[PDB]
Amino acid sequence: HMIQNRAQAVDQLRAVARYFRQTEPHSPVAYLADKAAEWADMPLHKWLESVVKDDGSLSHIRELLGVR
Amino acid sequence: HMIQNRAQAVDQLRAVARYFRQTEPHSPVAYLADKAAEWADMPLHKWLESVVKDDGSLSHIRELLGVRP
Amino acid sequence: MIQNRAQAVDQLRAVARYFRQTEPHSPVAYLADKAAEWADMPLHKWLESVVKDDGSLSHIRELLGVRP
Amino acid sequence: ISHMIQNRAQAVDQLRAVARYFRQTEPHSPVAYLADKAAEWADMPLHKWLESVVKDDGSLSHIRELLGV
Amino acid sequence: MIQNRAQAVDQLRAVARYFRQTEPHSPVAYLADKAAEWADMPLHKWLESVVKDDGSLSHIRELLGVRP
Amino acid sequence: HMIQNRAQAVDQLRAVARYFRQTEPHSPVAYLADKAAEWADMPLHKWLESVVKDDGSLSHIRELLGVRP
């Protein structure tokens, strides 16, 4: 099934997760496909908030982009 | 798009990465879909070596499994 | 020859039963049953019971997208 | 008693079989590791098993005195 | 010859009784009975009454999947 | 089931040890059934040497019995 848009790619990731979740309960692949699915619709600023550890490095990037 | 086996699931992850490289090159999603496809082809004891930070916790795990520390 | 996950679990348990009637001292039975509980235990749960270091667990959880 | 020696061989071989199943179907399953370690343990005499599992040398020596080793 | 584990345990008790009736100062009577107790004692119980260090014991219980 | 004398009781302990040693390599019964047979053929002063830990308590017992190394 040729992927035509972002929401289809998300559906395909979530599906891979379902395959592994019933086929291989230990595969970390499911955990990571499901994370990738959440990331797909996460706006850059939100994504940066959760991924960047240092509050200073984060403030700097918020300044380069202009957020509050 | 009904996943019949392990190969297809990996094939699809890769295809998801290919979609985001062409459509959204700033998407972190391509990186994950690929890390995930590597992880599929990596056995448990190997995956744990790259993921567990503390050496003592990693020796403990190896001991529960039987691997040679 | 073993066909699915459930047969493998019955075999393990059956092996454990065998060693419990014949070698009450063999650790084989204990391990056979430990393995059968692991069979259907998902990765994130298995990691909880095996990783000693709280920090290494927080990290692994973060890589996997698991929430506390 | 040779029928009892062979029944353990047969049990031990089903462990190996389980581990084989899991190694080929669920490469991330820790079950493959334990099932195989269970099979090592089956052909390991008690004092060797105690040597690898009893951490503290005091408790190990005492055990050796109880058993006479 | 000895055919099964109940028959072997009987010899032990039997040996204990012969030594108790013929040589009350013999320590063999005591050890034959200890052996007979041990025969019907599961590994986890046997370890419980043999291992001295709680550290060592709790570690073994973890390896075997036993709850204290 | 008819034990006639000391030597038969010792052969018997030995046979018990061989039965468990051949059938249950993890049973501690063999080790112990064999120590019993060792003890059987050991005189009291030797048995007391291997079993009494404190050298003062042992010297004293040697005095009570009139033994000399």
Numbering used by the authors:
A (entry chain D): 301 to 368
B (entry chain G), F (entry chain A): 301 to 369
C (entry chain C), E (entry chain B): 302 to 369
D (entry chain H): 299 to 367
The authors write:
Contractile bacteriophages of the family Myoviridae (i.e. T4), R-type pyocins and the type VI secretion system (T6SS) of Gram-negative bacteria are evolutionarily related nano-scale injection machines that puncture target cell membranes using a shared contraction mechanism. TssA subunits are enigmatic as they possess a conserved N-terminal region of unknown function, previously identified as ImpA_N (PFAM: PF0681226), whereas sequences located C-terminal to this region are highly divergent. Consistent with this, phylogenetic analysis has suggested that the TssA family can be subdivided into three clades (TssA1, TssA2 and TssA3). The structural studies presented here show that TssA1B, TssA2A and TssA2B possess structurally diverse CTDs that lead to distinct overall architectures for their respective complexes.
Each chain folds into four α-helices (α12-α15) that lie in approximately the same plane, and form two antiparallel pairs. The eight monomers in the asymmetric unit further assemble into a higher order oligomer of 32 subunits, consistent with the SEC-MALLS analysis of TssA1B and TssA1B CTD oligomers, with D16 symmetry using the crystallographic two-fold axes to make up a double-layered ring with 16 subunits in each layer. Further less extensive interactions (~570 Å2) were identified between dimers that facilitate formation of the ring, with each pair of helices α14-α15 in one dimer, together with a small number of residues from α13, interacting with their equivalents in adjacent 16-fold related dimers on either side. This type of interlocking series of interactions is repeated in a cyclic arrangement to form a double-layered ring. The C-termini of the TssA1B CTD monomers are located at the inner face of the ring, while their N-termini are orientated on the outside, consistent with EM analysis, which places the Nt1 domain at the periphery of the ring in the intact complex.
